[PDB]
Structure 1
């Protein structure tokens, strides 16, 4: 058909990495409001039907273990998988507590072969990366991956994602939502905008 088959026991797992406080050795500031963000996101995504678990002030190897363990889990009764990252981010890279980890390394574990159970099922990656002290990136290319990447109450992106999903999460296809989100943050405005990278093969709805 033209939609991802959503007929499974559970929707799927949803990991939230919520890096707020950073090790002195990175000169990275307190991301105030990431707590308002992560709460909003937990409530919103749990409402969709995800098995949300939040992890805070994660080290780089924590972030990598979290995700490798997740990939290693049996996902036969899951309709899909979803990771959300809140942090400082530069290019191809997220900040953990104790330094920087490359984004693509977190998703690698979920590839075609490496996660046979999650094959032909959407892997959803929501990234909200901050700048700021106080050059290139490679998006990995695999079927059934989606990224919603952003740069900046909590963040305008996070706020919008929840508001729309809370409201149309059950009746709109993933792309329509993210578009409405893209639109919403644009309205606020130098000028920045989230982007959606889609390697999806079908339409994604969070119901039926």
Structure 2
């Protein structure tokens, strides 16, 4: 029909990457308030029925590997997949404590041809990070 099939043993896995501290060399500062987001997000997605896992202060390598391995797990029994990224960022990119890595490379692991058990299943990514430095002053 018109709705995704949700009749599975479980709703799915929810991966949370909570990056608060970064290496001095990146020029990025401490993201105070991020723990508050992670806590609320985890409680929230747990209530929805996801198997949530929270990772903290990950390097770019850790982020790629972590998601690559999640995409290699068997999701046959899950209805969907969710990933939340909390960190610094610029356009098309997200910061690891190490430096910068492309969002496209992070999500490519779950393409239909590289993660067959999530094929035809919704793959969600929530991203809290900047995408440049333009300001919206608003109107009215």
Deviation per CA, 1:59-117, whole angstroms, max 9, x where unpaired? 00100011000000000000000000000010010000110000000001100110110
In structure 1, the gaps of 5 or more residues are: 131-178, 184-206
Give CA deviations for 1:122-176 in whole Å, capped at 9, x if unaligned: 000000004xxxxxxxxxxxxxxxxxxxxxxxxxxxxxxxxxxxxxxxxxxxxxx
1:16-63 deviation per Cα after TM superposition (whole angstroms, max 9, x unaligned): 000000011101011000000000000000110000000000000100
Deviation at 1:182, TM superposition (A): 15
CA gap of 1:181–1:8, structure 2 versus 1, over 3 A, is farther
- Structure 2 unmatched ranges of 5 or more: none
| Alignment-derived partner of residue 38 in structure 1 | 38
1:25–1:54: structure 2 CA closer, same or farther, 3 Å change rule?
Answer: same
Q: Which structure: greater strand fraction?
A: 2
Question: TM-score, normalised to structure 1's length?
Answer: 0.62
Higher relative contact order structure (alpha carbons within 8 Å, sequence separation ≥ 6): 2
Counterpart CA distance in 1 for 2:134 and 2:126 is 15
What is the aligned residue count? Answer: 137
Task: Say what the alpha-carbon RMSD is for the aligned residues.
Answer: 5.8
